[PDB]
From a paper:
Coronaviruses are enveloped viruses possessing large, trimeric spike glycoproteins (S) required for the recognition of host receptors for many coronaviruses as well as the fusion of viral and host cell membranes for viral entry into cells. The S1 subunit is responsible for host-receptor binding while the S2 subunit contains the membrane-fusion machinery. SARS-CoV makes use of its S1 RBD to bind to the human angiotensin-converting enzyme 2 (ACE2) as its host receptor. Here, we have used single-particle cryo-EM to determine structures of prefusion stabilized SARS-CoV S 2P ectodomain in uncleaved, S1/S2 cleaved and ACE2-bound states.
To examine the structural consequences binding ACE2 to the stabilized SARS-CoV S 2P, we combined SARS-CoV S 2P ectodomain with an excess of soluble human ACE2 with subsequent purification by size-exclusion chromatography and immediate cryo-EM specimen preparation. Initial sorting of particle heterogeneity indicated spikes could be split into ACE2-bound (45%) and unbound (55%) classes. As hypothesized by previous structural work, the S1 RBD of the stabilized spike recognizes ACE2 with an ‘up’ S1 RBD conformation. Despite prolonged co-incubation and an excess of ACE2, we had difficulties in saturating the S1 RBD with ACE2 in the context of stabilized trimeric S ectodomain. The reduced binding of ACE2 to trimeric spikes is likely due to the incomplete exposure and conformational flexibility of the S1 RBD. Hence, any conformational changes induced by receptor binding to the S1 RBD are more likely to be caused by the absence of the S1 RBD contacts in the ‘up’ conformation, rather than the formation of additional intra-spike contacts in a receptor-bound state. However, fine examination of the ACE2-bound S structure revealed a modest conformational change in the S2 central helix where the S2 had been uncapped by a receptor-bound RBD. However, in the ACE2-bound structure, the upper portion of the S2 helix uncapped by the ACE2-bound S1 RBD has transitioned to a 310-helix. The α- to 310-helix transition is unique to the S2 protomer uncapped by the ACE2-bound S1 RBD and is not observed in the other two copies of the trimeric spike.
Residue numbers in the entry:
A (entry chain B): 695 to 809, 818 to 823, 831 to 1127
B (entry chain A): 306 to 318, 515 to 663, 672 to 694
C (entry chain C): 841 to 937
D (entry chain C): 695 to 742
E (entry chain C): 986 to 1034
């Protein structure tokens, strides 16, 4: 069975890269304007020190994750003016200088389909429970700047674009090598150029209209915001836990009953919240280990799929990998796996071996099939029947050793010289 | 944190007057605590008396004395990070006041209600407001460099010669440009 | 209590038997796309020049290869017959929980 | 050095996949047919 | 019970990294001829099962 024709698909992949960093004050969480809380706190060690620096340490490693993904190139390549190269229409992928938002139209979908605690927005505000979200280091347009820079430089060099300083090559020629990478002769690109460019530019809009209306393909991102908000809400819910004390109100116990009575009651309460805060820390800490492990996979895919053709099947999506494309998103990336998929199979009868004058003629590459009239040679990726000479077939050993040998001849160009 | 200076105690018809925009130790009728007072705009009902957060925190109040809507806020708090170019390089530092209004920190430092304070410290007239918070002790140049000491929101701190500690916006890299053609290689 | 899994071992065997049966027919577009059909020896021959060996070495020594193939399988079969000494990893996860 | 003959090994590898999933009831663990166990855990949120 | 759940949770995430390796070794090692060394076992890989 040999395929004759093909298709080109653009398979999507969404991978999260970064978790929203948090911080928690002790006294504005466990005390609440209570002096005697702090007076009792001093018999519990300086726990706030490691409780600060654990969450600060994982806050720092969040920004370690992002620059481990993006901060790889050395030259901020400029957005080219023309956005249409050899029939391939990239104009919705680059950001628009005419309407400057520094985002693609595809990215503007992503900042919409994804759409308590202290936070600053430019006015800062903080709530009662001493906890907030620090903003990330690299802002989104800066991340979109690296996003636009790499895809721009992708369509110009590729390999030296991944080997440091880039080069210039015509984009169709760089396409043909990728076909030559998977064993397709480069004319097949050159002789199907409008059809491929049709199949390329239609498939973008087919993808573009796919994710536009519906959702839940992006579900791998919004859950991240959905899970840790529940983890934040978990800690806030725990304030009503009385822990066997009088109530979850310190001021009543300060006002109603005696301090020798209260300083076993609020003592029972403070050890309730302090033990409760440890559980939040630990689950926050171990989750940061998982996404960072997921980030190392993402950084590996950034350099092994975008900055170069890969060969491992079912990596970079299904099908034969051709070319990858990154897309920015909140807390993650989106990859675009432009892949090759063959089609139009037929039945043909094999020939492992050819008996001509008592010798065994084996192909240098390709196999031999009978199309119906005679025998031909072709490659496995594509049905291109060719002529059987010594140019593609060596001889080794005599005939009548192996199974399945065919009596046919070999053309030699020595003959017409007579 | 910020020391609560002031006390407002009111009752309907002992009573005190109405301090606003100051961290005071309020005491409304069966409502205690510290914080900063400011007028509200929340649509009450004739039987509403005080609002809450979606958490377990009252956030707004109606006056027992004059029946006026005020929203209450927590006083001020946050953490402190210390910036240094290295004891080998120099000996001056700068601080970040994490996620707090630089309008108010500048107010509280001249009235000296900040805990903790120090013996020998002054402003130095370099109060910049970052998105990450309040920066005191560094001058805002408008150049760009690589990020030595990150603070947040693309702003990084460094120590150049002008020698002093400077804050700026990051250099993403060199803006190279290369041609495209269909013959050139 | 222990919840039962979503799939049975027989359903896992249904994938396992299909892919092993589907291994002997197409190979590469078998998973990359739609399936194809190739004789097994020709599929074996692609592995040799895949690693850099001409197809004659298969096609000449085909009896020796096939006898190295099946006989070593039975040696693997009797290796995991007498005493276990290998599947401690699956014994570990049951020992852990 | 150039080899002449060969050998076809069959190397095995065993990988774990699935941990046995569990579940647990609180009142059949902490309470044990008690009432005041269940009647007094109301100051502890919904841990279960 | 609380320290059980967290200690159950770590080895849950531990084997999930191991399953990702199996997911790699299901596709890349079986559905195609790999070329990387000492992956897919020792020696020059031909065929996996
Ligand atoms: C490369 O691909 C891009 C698409 O990614 C393509 O640009 C598109 O061009 C068309 C027209 O040439 C644009 O369509 C118009 O867009 C404006 C504003 O977005 C709309 O207001 C227009 O609506 C009017 O026309 C409709 C159709 O008749 C009416 O139904 C309607 O009532 C309005 O009167 C219309 O939709 C399209 O927006 C762009 N897309 C982008 C992303 O810019 C470009 O032509 C391609 N170039 C090459 C060389 O292949
Ligand atoms: C590379 O190594 C391979 C090893 O697989 C080798 O192939 C072997 O070639 C020898 C050539 O003599 C074969 O040996 C004989 O084969 C016949 C075939 O039926 C057997 O019946 C013979 O058995 C006799 O001897 C045995 C051992 O003493 C007795 O147990 C038995 O009762 C018989 O008396 C004998 O083994 C051998 O079979 C193959 N191997 C296989 C798996 O077929 C190959 O030749 C080597 N390459 C080079 C270049 O040397
Ligand atoms: C299996 O491969 C065979 C390879 O030969 C296939 O047979 C060939 O099929 C093609 C169909 O595209 C024919 O090509 C056409 O031929 C006409 C006529 O050529 C004749 O006329 C010219 C001019 O007078 C003369 O000079 C020639 O000698 C021919 O006698 C051309 O005008 C067309 O441009 C076109 O090329 C081949 O002719 C034909 N070859 C033979 C030997 O029959 C066969 O179809 C394949 N089968 C399957 C199932 O794929
Ligand atoms: C810190 O708190 C002060 C309040 O004391 C905030 O200052 C306020 O800032 C806003 C804009 O950021 C000002 O609003 C503007 O008002 C003018 C006229 O009043 C109006 O024309 C504008 O459209 C805009 O609404 C506001 O006046 C100003 N108030 C004061 C007293 O300065 C400041 O924003 C806070 N900073 C942070 C980081 O939270
Ligand atoms: C390989 O497969 C491709 C993909 O199907 C084939 O291209 C497509 O071929 C069909 C007909 O075979 C074309 O449909 C026609 O389109 C025109 C214009 O819309 C219309 O007037 C006709 O009525 C019919 O619908 C289709 O346009 C074409 N697609 C492209 C991008 O060219 C191709 O023919 C196959 N080639 C081989 C050698 O198998
Ligand atoms: C493919 O072609 C080869 C050669 O053209 C065919 O092999 C030939 O098979 C015949 C059997 O009819 C052999 O003939 C025998 O020759 C001996 C020589 O003395 C003679 O004593 C016998 O009575 C008989 O005539 C012939 O030697 C042999 N030639 C070669 C080079 O092997 C082969 O049969 C063809 N394939 C098919 C499927 O027919
Ligand atoms: C509780 O009692 C106090 C008095 O002890 C009430 O305060 C009074 O409020 C009214 C209206 O806000 C003030 O009336 C105004 O007086 C000026 C000058 O006298 C007049 O020109 C205006 O037209 C207006 O009528 C009144 O002065 C003020 N009294 C004091 C001593 O401040 C308060 O309103 C009572 N609470 C409630 C909920 O009614
Ligand atoms: C090869 O050609 C390219 C363009 O055809 C050259 O790039 C230009 O180089 C000049 C200086 O040599 C710059 O002033 C231009 O700005 C460059 N073009 C762009 C678009 O940036 C390149 O320098 C040439 N290289 C060699 C070695 O000849
Ligand atoms: C190939 O042959 C099989 C039977 O051997 C048949 O089922 C199938 O439809 C054929 N396909 C083509 C494309 O000829
Ligand atoms: C400090 O830096 C100087 C160079 O500026 C270097 O020579 C010296 O060894 C450094 N000393 C310490 C204690 O770091």
């Amino acid at each position: 069975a040999i395929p004759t024709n093909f298709s080109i698909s653009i398979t999507t992949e969404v991978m999260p890269v970064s978790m929203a960093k948090t911080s928690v004050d002790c006294n504005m969480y466990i005390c609440g304007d209570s002096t005697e809380c702090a007076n009792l706190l001093l018999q519990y060690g300086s726990f706030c020190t490691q409780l600060n620096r654990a969450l600060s340490g994982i806050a720092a490693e969040q920004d370690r994750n992002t620059r481990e993904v993006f901060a790889q190139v050395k030259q901020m390549y400029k957005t080219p003016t023309l956005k249409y190269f050899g029939g391939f229409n990239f104009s919705q992928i680059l950001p628009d200088p005419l309407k400057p938002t520094k985002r693609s139209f595809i990215e503007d979908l992503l900042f919409n389909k994804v759409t308590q605690y202290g936070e600053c927005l430019l006015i800062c505000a903080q709530k009662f429970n001493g906890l907030t979200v620090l903003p990330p280091l690299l802002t989104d347009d800066m991340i979109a700047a690296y996003t636009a820079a790499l895809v721009s430089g992708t369509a110009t060099a590729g390999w030296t674009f991944g080997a440091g300083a880039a080069l210039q090559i015509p984009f169709a020629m760089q396409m043909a090598y990728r076909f030559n990478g998977i064993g397709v002769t480069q004319n097949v690109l050159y002789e199907n150029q409008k059809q491929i460019a049709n199949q390329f530019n239609k498939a973008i809009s087919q993808i573009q209209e796919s994710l536009t209306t519906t959702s839940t393909a992006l579900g791998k991102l919004q859950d991240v915001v959905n899970q840790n908000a529940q983890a934040l809400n978990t800690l806030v819910k725990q304030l009503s836990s009385n822990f066997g004390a009088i109530s979850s109100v310190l001021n009543d116990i300060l006002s109603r009953l005696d301090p020798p009575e209260a300083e076993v009651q609020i003592d029972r309460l403070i050890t309730g919240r302090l033990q409760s805060l440890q559980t939040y820390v630990t689950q926050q800490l171990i989750r940061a280990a998982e996404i960072r492990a997921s980030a190392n996979l993402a950084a590996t895919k950034m350099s092994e799929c975008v900055l170069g053709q890969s060969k491992r099947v079912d990596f970079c999506g299904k099908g034969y990998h051709l070319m990858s494309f990154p897309q920015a998103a909140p807390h993650g990336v989106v990859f675009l796996h432009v892949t090759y998929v063959p089609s139009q199979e037929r039945n043909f009868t094999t020939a492992p071996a050819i008996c001509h004058e008592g010798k065994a003629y084996f192909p240098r590459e390709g196999v031999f099939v009978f199309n119906g009239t005679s025998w031909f040679i072709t490659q496995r990726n594509f049905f291109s029947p060719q002529i059987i000479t010594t140019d593609n077939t060596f001889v080794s050993g005599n005939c009548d050793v192996v199974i399945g040998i065919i009596n046919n001849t070999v053309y030699d160009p020595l003959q017409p010289e007579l | 944190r910020v020391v609560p200076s002031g006390d407002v105690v009111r009752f309907p018809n002992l009573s005190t007057d109405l301090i606003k925009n100051q961290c005071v130790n309020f005491n409304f009728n069966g409502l205690t605590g510290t914080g900063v007072l400011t007028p509200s705009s929340k649509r009450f009902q004739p039987f509403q008396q005080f609002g809450r957060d979606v958490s377990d925190f009252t956030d707004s109040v109606r006056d027992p004395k004059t029946s006026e809507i005020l929203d209450i806020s927590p006083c001020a708090f946050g953490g402190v990070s210390v910036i240094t170019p290295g004891t080998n390089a120099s000996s001056e530092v700068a601080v970040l006041y994490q996620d707090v209004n630089c309008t108010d920190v500048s107010t509280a430092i001249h009235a000296d209600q900040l805990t903790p304070a120090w013996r020998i410290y002054s402003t130095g007239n370099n109060v910049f407001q970052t998105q990450a918070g309040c920066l005191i002790g560094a001058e805002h140049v408008d150049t760009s460099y690589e990020c030595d000491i990150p603070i947040g929101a693309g702003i990084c701190a460094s120590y150049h010669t002008v020698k002093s500690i400077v804050a700026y916006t990051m250099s993403l890299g060199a803006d190279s440009s290369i041609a495209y053609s269909n013959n050139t290689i």
